[PDB]
Amino acid sequence: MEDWKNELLVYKFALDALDTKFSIISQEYNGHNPIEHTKSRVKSFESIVNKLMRKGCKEHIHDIAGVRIICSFISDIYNVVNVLKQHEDLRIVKVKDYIQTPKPNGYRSLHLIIEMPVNLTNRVEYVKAEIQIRTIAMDFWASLEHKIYYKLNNDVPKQLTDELKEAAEIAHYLDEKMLGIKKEV
Amino acid sequence: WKNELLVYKFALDALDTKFSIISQEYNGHNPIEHTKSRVKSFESIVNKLMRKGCEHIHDIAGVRIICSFISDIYNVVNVLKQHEDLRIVKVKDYIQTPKPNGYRSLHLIIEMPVNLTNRVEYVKAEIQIRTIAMDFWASLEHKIYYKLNNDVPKQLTDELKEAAEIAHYLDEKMLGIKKEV
Amino acid sequence: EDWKNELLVYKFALDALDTKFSIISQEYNGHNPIEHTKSRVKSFESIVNKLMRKGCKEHIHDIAGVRIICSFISDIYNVVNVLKQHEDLRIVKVKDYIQTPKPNGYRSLHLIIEMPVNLTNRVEYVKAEIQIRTIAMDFWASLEHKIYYKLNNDVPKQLTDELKEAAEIAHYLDEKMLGIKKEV
Amino acid sequence: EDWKNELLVYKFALDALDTKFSIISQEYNGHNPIEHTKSRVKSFESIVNKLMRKGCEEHIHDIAGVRIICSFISDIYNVVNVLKQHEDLRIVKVKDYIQTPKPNGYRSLHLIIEMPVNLTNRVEYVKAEIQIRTIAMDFWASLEHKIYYKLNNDVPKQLTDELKEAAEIAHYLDEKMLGIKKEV
C-alpha cells in the first residue's frame, strides 16, 4: 500500500542519522579508528513480505534498517559495542554474540538490535535497527555465503557447505593470529 | 582547545542530516538548495572575543540555509520549532527590519545536544537562513570589506544598499509569481 | 536493447566532464568563478518527446547537459576562453543568449562541444551542451520550467509578462552587482 | 620554488584516474570486481624522505598512487586486461608480486603507467603506480606499515616471521575462497 512510503522513509532517516554517529564514533579516535567502511541497507518491502510470508501482514521485524560495522580487529568489535552502551539516544534491546558461539555455518558476527528515536517535524518516532559488527574476513565470508545461496536457491551440497566451514575456521584463526600481532605493539 | 572545537564540528555534522531530512519531507518541492557549514577558527574566536574577557559566543558553529523563496525561509523556522532535539535561544529576523547596510537574513541561535561517548554536551549554533540573492549580496559585501579592510567609501556602500534594495524587490516579485501556481 | 549501451557513453562523458571542471576550478581556487556544476543525463521519456518531432538518431545535442553557474557575467566568458584552450574538446556550436535574449527573457550562454571518452572497447565522440549562467539566470530558468510544468504550457500573458519583468531586473542586478566588484 | 605547479598535476591525474576506475566499474554494473578505490597523492614531505637515496629537487613513480582492492585473485588480472585495452594510458612497468612474492610475504600486482592529463595550458604525461590487491592483501600491508612505524624500522625476527605466517594463510584463504566461487 502507500501507507508504506511514509513508514519505510522514517527508517531511511534513522540510517542517515546513524552514519554521523558512527562517523563521530571514529572521530573520537580519528588515537586510531577501527571502523573502515559502513554499509546500511533498508529492506525492499517485498523481502519484508516474503519474510512476513512466514507470519501475517506488524512492526516487529528488526532488520528493516540494517547497518554493518566492519572493524579491523576482533578487540575493536567489543570496543564499539561497549561504547554504544554509553550513548543515550539509543538503547540496546538485544545482543547476540555469534563470536565464540558461532552458527554451524561458521558464521560469526555481533548483532545488536536497538531502539532509535527519530526527530521529525510533527513529533518523534522510535524505530528499531539491527547492527551487525564484523571484522574484515567476517563480512567477506558472509557476503560470499549469501551470493552462493542466491544463485543455487538454498540447495547447496554438503562439500560446498563444508568448504565454507573450513573458510570460517581460518578467517577467525586469521583474525585471531592477526590480533596477537597487534598485541605485541 | 583541540578537543572542544571538535564537539562543535560534530554538532554541524549532525545538523546536515536534519536539514537533509527536512527537505526529504517535501521530496512537493524542497526549498533548501545548498547548505554551507563553517566552524570558526581559533584565531577568529579570540579577536571577536577581544571585546570582552577570555563559550558565550554563539556563531562558533554557523550554518547557512539558502532557500528558494522568502516564504520558504519561515517554513524552515516553523519546522525547526516543532523539533525537540534543539531549542531556539534567540531569533533575529533581519528581513522586514534590515540593517542600514541593506543586509537581510534570519539568524537564530539554538542549543544542540551532542551525544558523545562519555556523556552529552549542549552546544550553541547560529543558523543563518537566506534566499539566493541574500547570500550573494552578503558574500559580495564581505569580500569588499575584506579587500578594503573596513575602509569602504560612501559611494560604494550606497550601491551595495541600492543593490540590496533591488534584490529584495526581486525576491519579492519572484515569490508572487510562484503564488499564481 | 542497444539504447542501454549508447546512453551509458553519454553518462560516462559527464563523469569525464565533471573532473575537467573540477580541474578547471582547481586552477583558479586566484579566484574561481564556478560555484555549482550540475550534470543531468537526459531522461529516456524526455528524449522521445523531443524526438517526436523527428523519427525514433543522435542529432539531439543536450543528451548530456552541464550547468555552469558562475558568479558574474565577466566570469562566464572566462570559462569560455578556458574551454577554448582545451584540446580534448572542440566547440561545435555557440548560442550567446546573453545580450541577444529570447522574448521570454531567457539568458544563458550555451555552447555544444564534442568530447572524446576513452573506454575499454575504443573511444567514442559524443556531444554535450554546456549552459553557463549566473546565479539569477539559473533561478529564473528553473522557476519558469516549474511554472510551465504545472500549468501545462497554458500560461496567461500576465504571468509571462511578470517573468519578463523579473528577468530584465535580475540582469540589471547582475550588471549593477558586476560594476560594484570593478571598483575593487 | 614552484614545486606547487608540478606536484599539483599529480593531484589532477588522480581526479582523472578516479573517473576511469569509476567508469570501468560502470561497464560491469555483469558484475563488478572493483570494490573501493583510494587515491593518495604523496605528501610533500614523503617525497623528500623517499628521495634520500638520490639527490633532492621526477623519477619517483608513486607520487600519484591508486589502490584497486578486488574481491578475488581472478578479478585482479581482469582489471589488468581492461587497463591494457585503454589507449589513454600505457603500462611502462609491471611487477606481479603475486606468484613472485617478497621474502616478507608482501603480495600485490603493481604496474606503473603513463597518463596524459589535459590541462588548460597543455597536456602533461605523468607516471602513476597502481597497486591492485585483494581484501586480505590491503589489510596485511596496512598492518605491516603500522608496525614498522611504531617500532621505527626495528622489528624483531618473530614478528616478521609471524607476519609471513599470517600472510601465507591469507593468500591460501584467497585461493580457497576463489575456488568456492568457481563451483557456482
- Same domain assignment for residues A102 and A33: yes
Give the DSSP letter string of C82-116: HHHT-SS-EEEEEEE-SSS--TT----EEEEEEEE
- Same domain assignment for residues B119 and B169: no
Residue A116 DSSP class: E
Question: Which residues in chain D are contacts of C123 at CB distance < 8 A?
Answer: 87
Nearest to B174 among C166, C172, C176 (CB): C166
Nearest to D19 among C15, C88, C123 (CB): C15
Residue A27 DSSP class: H
Specify whether A59 is catalytic: no
- Same domain assignment for residues B5 and B94: yes
Cell readout for B47 is 579577536
Tell whether D81 lies on the interface with C, counting CB pairs under 8 A. no
CA proximity to D58, closest of D45, D47, D66: D47
Tell me the C-alpha distance between D36 and D162, whole Å.
Answer: 28
What experimental approach yielded this model? X-ray
Tell whether B54 lies on the interface with A, counting CB pairs under 8 A. no
Does residue C166 contact residue B177 with C-beta atoms inside 8 Å? yes
CA proximity to B175, closest of C168, C152, C139: C139
- Same domain assignment for residues D151 and D174: yes
Tell me the C-alpha distance between B165 and D184, whole Å.
Answer: 70
- Same domain assignment for residues A131 and A166: no
CA proximity to C65, closest of C88, C46, C84, C78: C46
Residue whose C-alpha cell is 551440497: A157
Cell readout for C83 is 574551454
Say yes or no for a CB contact (<8 Å) between A16 and B20. yes
- Same domain assignment for residues D144 and D130: no
- Same domain assignment for residues B68 and B92: yes
Question: Which residues in chain B are contacts of A18 at CB distance < 8 A?
Answer: none
- The gap between the terminal CA atoms of chain C, to the nearest Å, is 57
For residue C41, give the CATH number of its domain: 3.30.460.10
Cell readout for C70 is 558562475
* Helices D157-182 + D135-151 axis angle, to 10: 170
Nearest to A185 among D150, D169, D183 (CB): D150
Does residue C133 contact residue C75 with C-beta atoms inside 8 Å? no
Count of domains for chain B = 2
Does residue A142 contact residue A109 with C-beta atoms inside 8 Å? yes
In chain A, residues preceding a discontinuity (C to N beyond 2.5 A) are 30, 57
For residue D2, with 0-12 CB atoms within 10 Å meaning exposed, 13-18 middle and 19 or more buried, which class applies?
Answer: exposed
Instruction: Count H helices and E strands in chain C, helices first.
Output: 5, 5
- Same domain assignment for residues D131 and D145: no
Does residue D61 contact residue D112 with C-beta atoms inside 8 Å? yes
Distance from CA of A19 to the nearest CA of B (A): 9
Give the DSSP letter string of C33-86: -EEEEEEEEPPHHHHHHHHTTS------STTEEEEEEESSHHHHHHHHHHHHT-
Q: Which residues contact C67 (CB under 8 A, 6 or more apart)?
A: C36, C37, C38, C40, C131, C132, C133, C138
Tell whether D176 lies on the interface with A, counting CB pairs under 8 A. yes
Say yes or no for a CB contact (<8 Å) between C85 and D118. no
- Same domain assignment for residues D20 and D105: yes
Q: Give the torsion through C-alpha atoms of A162, A166, A168, A171, to 10 deg.
A: -160
CA proximity to A121, closest of D100, C80, B30, B24: B24
Q: CA-CA distances (angstroms) from residue A138 to A64, A133, A134, B169, C114?
A: 21, 9, 6, 61, 48
- Same domain assignment for residues C68 and C98: yes
CA angle A182, A183, A184 (to 5 degrees): 90
CB atoms within 10 A of CB D29: 9
Q: CA-CA distances (angstroms) from residue B8 to B11, B13, B17, D169?
A: 5, 9, 15, 45
CA angle B110, B116, B121 (to 5 degrees): 35
- Same domain assignment for residues D155 and D115: no
Entry resolution (Å): 3.2
Q: Which residues contact C109 (CB under 8 A, 6 or more apart)?
A: C76, C77, C80, C94, C95, C96, C97, C98, C131, C132, C133
CA proximity to D141, closest of D91, D62, D67, D71: D67
CA proximity to C79, closest of D122, B34, D120, B143: D120
Q: How many residues does chain A have?
A: 185
Question: Which domain range does residue C64 map to?
Answer: 1-137
- Same domain assignment for residues B98 and B69: yes
